[PDB]
Amino acid sequence: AVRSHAEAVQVSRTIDWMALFVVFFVIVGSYHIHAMLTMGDWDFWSDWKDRRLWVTVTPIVLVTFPAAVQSYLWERYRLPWGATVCVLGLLLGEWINRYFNFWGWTYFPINFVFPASLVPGAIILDTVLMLSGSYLFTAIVGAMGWGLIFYPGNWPIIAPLHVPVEYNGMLMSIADIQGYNYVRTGTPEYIRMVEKGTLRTFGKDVAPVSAFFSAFMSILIYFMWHFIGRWFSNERFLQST
């Protein structure tokens, strides 16, 4: 077994670090695959970071892994950082690829290929879970906040890119000029799923409406993925495959 109390503590600490590595990087791989194949195109390009589609889609598809990892970590260890660790791992993988491949392999500027910020939403989700340990309360209030705080959290980053520019007779934002100048051979402009205006777009409501829709759908997706993570935690021994 173990020699003494001290050696047990040291063994537990070593296990803690190794299992933290395993959790963090398996989450990085799986969460990054899910994110980049469910929100990657908006996350890739500043001229894709719009007010309708980016704000709508990103929190909805990104609340998935935080819900499951929360439902496991909080329930089994009272560790209230499942959402934070998921978001940090996604950001780390995204930034590594942006710097070494988007800017390293290809030579797209970082101010063009930067990822979105998600830590505020993750912190809200984690704190709202730890306080008032109710998973239902988390799914309702914390997911609401996660959806709502996405665009305001990223506004300090993208606001300078929205300064209007008179570009060769046409009005363009700085992000628009970035997308125009830095040629993406595989990504023509029409692929861009961004706000284009509708006849039923009343007043200045595009960003808040998208944020509230994303918050509601985030509630729904969090509710689903809490139980998905509950299943994924199963310790069953399927006798034969």
Binding site: S12, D16, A19, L20, D47, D50, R51, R76, Y77, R78, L79, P80, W81, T84, V87, L92, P109, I110, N111, S117, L118, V119, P120, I123, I124, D126, T127, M130, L131, P152, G153, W155, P156, I157, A159, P160, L161, H162, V163, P164, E166, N168, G169, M170, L171, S173, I174, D176, I177, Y180, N181, Y182, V183, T185, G186, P188, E189, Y190, R192, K196
Partner: protein, 382 residues
């Protein structure tokens, strides 16, 4: 570099690029190179490709080795997707600024919303200098000049690092104590209610309140600075002005067209009727980025890519001048190594063995006529 893999018949009948020109073949960093030409949208647009209702004038290149300074269809700038009409001919102009040193194969391409990339002829353009010398200045309507290479980079890095640090601080705060196995045992064996106690709840409340307050304050500060912002400008642009070409005075009827399998030649029999009032002669056959030239009639001087140019690849059985009003039938053979290099011979693998192309007819004075031909392409094996 992305063609030679697409279907031969689809490359033949989507878009015909001609009158292509390049302002320079070798450039310095920050120097501008302009690509001009015309493209014709083929009438027999394949049903598998969506109609070019939403199309984008793009550049085929290995990443931003050039930056697209300007692009025009007709005479107007087209930074967004555009609507093209089948059967119409448009003139285009793309202005590129050199950014990365090296030898780059630059293609002019048209991306269609529901059909994918239509790659035109590509030309090797040499860039010399250093990437560090590249500048992309732009002046905003707020009266400030910024360099797009590094503008907002510091702010982006700062905010991302700040939020990452906040998350790492949260995780480390909870990670100072033992993490996995003792906490699991405490939760399992009896009620836990001991690993989350004040001031842990106070720290979490502080984290939540600080996160919300910092987000609100940062948004307000980013609104006070940059008080003038506009949304992303998007939307397909209609009303592209097509070229008003004169009606051709030459009519050509394709009476069968064959190619040997295997082989590097394509043979077709054409009935050419000369209207107007000048003797014409067949000078060129363009099928898919490949120009088969009759050197005795016409010579290329626009610096067309050599691997796509067949200087004497077009042989006409009787290419004597065609008097006005006279109709004759000739056997036309287009033969060049390009027919196999660019896999135009692989139309035998295609599910639609039909070809399309452009015939260029030249008279004595030098003025030229463009006629379009399309017919089934029948392989021959024995």
């Amino acid at each position: 570099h992305g063609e030679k893999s697409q279907a031969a018949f689809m490359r033949m009948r989507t878009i015909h690029w001609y009158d292509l020109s390049w302002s320079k073949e070798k450039v310095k960093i920050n120097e501008t190179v302009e690509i001009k030409g015309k493209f014709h949208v083929f009438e027999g647009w394949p049903e598998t490709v969506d109609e070019p209702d939403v199309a984008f004038l793009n550049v085929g290149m290995p990443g931003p080795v050039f930056i697209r300074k300007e692009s025009y269809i007709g005479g107007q700038l087209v930074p967004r997707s555009v609507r093209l009409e089948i059967g119409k001919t448009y003139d285009f102009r793309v202005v590129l600024k050199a950014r990365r040193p090296g030898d780059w194969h630059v293609h002019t391409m048209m991306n269609v919303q529901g059909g994918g990339p239509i790659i035109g002829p590509g030309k090797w353009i040499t860039v010399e200098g250093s990437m560090s010398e590249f500048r992309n200045p732009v002046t905003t309507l707020t009266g400030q000049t910024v360099d797009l290479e590094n503008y907002n980079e510091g702010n982006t890095y700062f905010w991302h690092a700040f939020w990452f640090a906040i998350g790492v601080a949260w995780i480390g705060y909870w990670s100072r104590r033992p993490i996995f196995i003792p906490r699991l045992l405490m939760v399992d064996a009896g009620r836990a209610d001991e690993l989350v106690s004040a001031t842990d709840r106070k720290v979490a409340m502080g984290f939540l309140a600080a996160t919300i307050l910092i987000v609100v304050m940062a948004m307000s500060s980013a609104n006070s600075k940059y008080p003038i912002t506009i949304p992303l400008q998007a939307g397909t642009m209609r009303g592209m002005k097509p070229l008003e070409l004169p009606a051709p005075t030459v009519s050509v009827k394709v009476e069968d067209a064959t190619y040997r399998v295997p082989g590097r030649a394509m043979r077709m029999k054409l009935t050419i009727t000369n209207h107007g009032n000048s003797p014409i002669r067949l000078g060129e056959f363009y099928t898919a980025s490949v120009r088969f030239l009759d050197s005795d009639v016409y010579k290329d001087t626009t610096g067309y890519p050599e691997d796509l140019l067949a200087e004497d690849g077009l042989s006409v059985s009787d290419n004597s001048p065609l008097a006005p009003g006279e109709t004759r039938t000739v056997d036309v053979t287009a033969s060049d190594a390009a027919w196999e290099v660019y896999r135009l011979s692989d139309i035998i693998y295609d599910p639609d063995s039909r070809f399309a192309g452009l015939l260029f007819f030249f008279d004595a004075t030098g003025n030229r006529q463009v006629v379009q031909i399309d017919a089934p392409l029948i392989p021959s094996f024995m």
